[PDB]
Amino acid sequence: SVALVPHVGMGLETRTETWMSSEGAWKHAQRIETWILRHPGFTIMAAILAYTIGTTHFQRALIFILLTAVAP
Amino acid sequence: SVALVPHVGMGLETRTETWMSSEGAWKHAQRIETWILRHPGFTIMAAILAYTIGTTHFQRALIFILLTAVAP
Amino acid sequence: DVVVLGSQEGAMHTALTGATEIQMSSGNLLFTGHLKCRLRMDKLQLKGM
Amino acid sequence: DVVVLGSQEGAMHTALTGATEIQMSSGNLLFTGHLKCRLRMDKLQLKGM
């Protein structure tokens, strides 16, 4: 809805503290960890698919962290 | 905020309709579509970085659509 | 300085997608879901026999 | 049936994460930004020589 597309990377930065920094600076990193520790089986199975799709370890960790990131 | 975690994969879905079936089934794809049409160069750079990693076509396309879908 | 942070009514009506509405105004009347029924029909007449 | 969605105020306050707050309750006074200013100080003596 309107509470998505949150007007983040659009230039316009200054020295002044914005509307939400230190509140919105870490909201995704908290809701992802909450979502992982209340939905673990998709992270195990995403580690299985990421270990399957990918030859070197860098793209395995990359596909793991992107597949973990795309889920809400 | 609370407008995230949108109660999607929770089980509990019956034959009855939910609160925003057919108005929440496509808001994610419309949001990503208008985001790409407002921000093309990250999708060009996502194509470039998706191409140099991924020594086969499948994980190039996979890392491309995941890197597209992570950024709002 | 401190500020209040608005109303999350329409923000949470966005959050309640995928969650089936019930009717709690007078009684907690649900209108979703199912139940399993074992149906024994040993004592049915036919009304026309 | 047709229902309204509700107050979008707090969701709008979530939408503005990354918008620099100004005030316009009186005037339109910004308190952000900058300007490149060429300072030209020719006739600037010392007051005390």
Curated annotation (Swiss-Prot), chains C, D:
Top-rank taxon, per record: Viruses
Record PTM: N-glycosylated.
Q: How does it sit in the membrane?
A: Multi-pass membrane protein
State its location(s): Virion membrane; Host endoplasmic reticulum membrane
Q: What quaternary structure, including any partners, is listed in this protein's UniProt entry?
A: Homodimer; in the endoplasmic reticulum and Golgi. Interacts with protein prM. Interacts with non-structural protein 1.
Its biological purpose is as follows: Binds to host cell surface receptor and mediates fusion between viral and cellular membranes. Envelope protein is synthesized in the endoplasmic reticulum in the form of heterodimer with protein prM. They play a role in virion budding in the ER, and the newly formed immature particle is covered with 60 spikes composed of heterodimer between precursor prM and envelope protein E. The virion is transported to the Golgi apparatus where the low pH causes dissociation of PrM-E heterodimers and formation of E homodimers. prM-E cleavage is inefficient, and many virions are only partially matured.
Q: What is this protein called?
A: Envelope protein E
